[PDB]
């Protein structure tokens, strides 16, 4: 029967009763790192985050090796509560900026990251620690910088590229920066690779670096938690509905549904 299956929708997503966050030009990852279009998303919370097909990044060219996993982690958690922290950044210059990441017409950078360069032509071996003495877990986002040329590498860090090691008592992550010119993006042949690390209470964050480090300014709180993300170009209207799809919201009364596999909230079984 067809009275058991739902096939239609208004085409709109209803803004109630689930907290929906429309990304517009921004991906979740960009709102996390702090891309300048995405400054309004700071410390926002949500039950469902909606990515758009038109989304574009407009900052430093970067890649995230474990993109999906990170995008999914932060998704479930459903918060961007960030906390600034006082790292001991001695011996280095802070707040590097780029003409590729524009903010108020001035060269800037990802709001949540800290680009360290040499100070007086020295870049000491960093041995900096940040303990989690809190009750909850801390989520730290950091990166490694891959300059286009050796000339840039010496300009920025005053020595050749060496290993970056981010470890805790439970794990260790080690990256080797790779000097090499990758195709220009926003006139930038350099790249940044994004990595992440979770620190449990009583555990400690340990950073080891001789350059190429793109440092965190602090941590996000990690829930997880049942929130989510859906890729959809569907418009948003004012209404109430418990079940949302990428083709729009639908009512939750039939046992089945053939509009789309992906749903959030109290929904029918997909059938087809």
Ligand X SMILES: *[C@H]1O[C@H](CO)[C@@H](O)[C@H](O)[C@H]1NC(C)=O
Task: Kindly list the residues in this chain that would bind ligand X in the complex (CB under 6 A).
Answer: 25, 37, 88, 90, 94-95, 127, 163, 165, 208
- Decide whether 25 or 117 has the Cβ nearer to ligand X: 25
CB of residue 40 vs ligand X: minimum separation in angstroms?
9
Residue 260's contacts (CB-CB under 8 Å, 6 or more residues apart) are 245, 246, 247, 270
CB of residue 131 vs ligand X: minimum separation in angstroms?
13
Q: Which two tokens stand for residue 215?
A: 């440092």
Q: Which two tokens stand for residue 65?
A: 């090796």
CB of residue 96 vs ligand X: minimum separation in angstroms?
10
Angstrom distance (rounded) from CA 145 to CA 182 = 13
- Decide whether 148 or 218 has the Cβ nearer to ligand X: 218
CB of residue 268 vs ligand X: minimum separation in angstroms?
35
**What is the residue whose two structure tokens read 């300059």?**
147
- The backbone torsions φ and ψ at residue 70, rounded to the nearest 5 degrees and listed phi first, read -60, -50
CB of residue 208 vs ligand X: minimum separation in angstroms?
3
**What is the residue whose two structure tokens read 């990044």?**
57
Angstrom distance (rounded) from CA 88 to CA 229 = 36
Between the CA atoms of 188, 189, 190 and 196, what dihedral angle is there, to the nearest 10 degrees?
80
- Decide whether 15 or 208 has the Cβ nearer to ligand X: 208
Q: Tell me, rounded to whole angstroms, the distance of Cα 113 from its chain centroid.
A: 11
Angstrom distance (rounded) from CA 18 to CA 74 = 17
CB of residue 76 vs ligand X: minimum separation in angstroms?
26
| Residue pair 122/115 in contact by the 8 Å Cβ criterion | no
């Amino acid at each position: 029967g067809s009275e058991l299956v739902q096939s239609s929708s208004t085409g709109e997503i209803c803004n109630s009763p689930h907290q929906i966050l429309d990304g517009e030009n921004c991906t979740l990852i960009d709102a996390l790192l702090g891309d300048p279009q995405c400054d309004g998303f700071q410390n926002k919370k949500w039950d469902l985050f909606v990515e758009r097909s038109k989304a574009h990044s407009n900052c430093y060219p970067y890649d995230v090796p474990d993109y999906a996993s990170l995008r999914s982690l932060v998704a479930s958690s459903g918060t961007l509560e960030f906390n600034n922290e006082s790292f001991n950044w001695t011996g280095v210059t802070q707040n590097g900026t780029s003409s590729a990441c524009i903010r108020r017409s001035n060269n800037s950078f990802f709001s949540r990251l800290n680009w360290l360069t040499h100070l007086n032509f020295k870049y000491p071996a960093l041995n900096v620690t940040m303990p989690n003495n809190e009750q909850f877990d801390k989520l730290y986002i950091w990166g490694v910088h891959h300059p286009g040329t050796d000339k840039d590498q010496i300009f920025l860090y005053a020595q050749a590229a060496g290993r970056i090691t981010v470890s805790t008592k439970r794990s260790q992550q080690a990256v080797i920066p790779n000097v090499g010119s990758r195709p220009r993006v926003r006139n930038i042949p350099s790249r940044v690779s994004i990595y992440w690390t979770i620190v449990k209470p009583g555990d400690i964050l340990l950073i080891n670096s001789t350059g190429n480090l793109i440092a965190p300014r602090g941590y996000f709180k990690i829930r997880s938690g049942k929130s989510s993300i859906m890729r959809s170009d569907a418009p948003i209207g004012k209404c109430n509905s418990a079940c949302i799809t990428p083709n729009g919201s639908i009512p939750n009364d039939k046992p089945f549904q053939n509009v789309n596999r992906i749903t959030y909230g109290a929904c029918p079984r997909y059938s087809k």
